[PDB]
């Protein structure tokens, strides 16, 4: 079942791409382990807006898994810049272990 790979003896071939869900932040903090710019960890109990928005993604994800399709979309707006709405988007994405598709 197991095996060893040696560059001088073992050959490797890249193949087509395969989907796989990313780990939720609960099981590990990849940024912290790799020492990247760790994204600020919200305490949902103290950030009600973040909680409300999160209360969307997992429900959509479950209903999809439960065979229920529903186009869940949401738009962030604010009265002042520099509030990290994108930061909270990333935080929510990592929280549920969901792939992120950011387009500036």
């Amino acid at each position: 079942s197991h095996f060893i790979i040696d560059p001088n003896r073992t050959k490797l071939i890249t193949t087509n791409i395969t989907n796989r869900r990313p780990l939720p932040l609960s099981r590990s903090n990849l940024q912290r382990y790799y020492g990247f710019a760790e994204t600020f960890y919200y305490d949902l109990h103290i950030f009600p807006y973040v909680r409300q928005l999160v209360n969307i993604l997992e429900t959509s994800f479950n209903c999809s898994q439960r065979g229920i399709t529903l186009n869940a979309s949401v738009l962030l707006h604010s009265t002042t810049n520099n509030v990290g709405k994108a930061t909270m988007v990333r935080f929510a994405s990592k929280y549920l272990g969901i792939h992120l598709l950011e387009i500036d």
Partner: protein, 66 residues
């Protein structure tokens, strides 16, 4: 154009029927016995059918939260 036709905002009875059907579409929904569609329409005046769509989906989500 000889004559024309205009789609004014839906009426309360229209709203009762439309809300019932929209709930039906996501048949997974259910409602309390006391809550009746006719009663429901009385407080949803001046809403476009798409508005009722989004409102029912929002309600479905709200139920999912709890």
């Amino acid at each position: 154009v000889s004559e024309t036709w205009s789609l004014r905002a839906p009426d309360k009875h229209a709203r009762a029927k439309l809300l019932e059907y929209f709930f039906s579409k996501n048949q997974i929904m259910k409602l309390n016995r006391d809550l009746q569609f006719s009663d429901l329409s009385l407080e949803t005046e001046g809403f476009s059918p798409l508005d009722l769509e989004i409102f029912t989906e929002k309600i479905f989500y709200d139920l999912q939260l709890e």
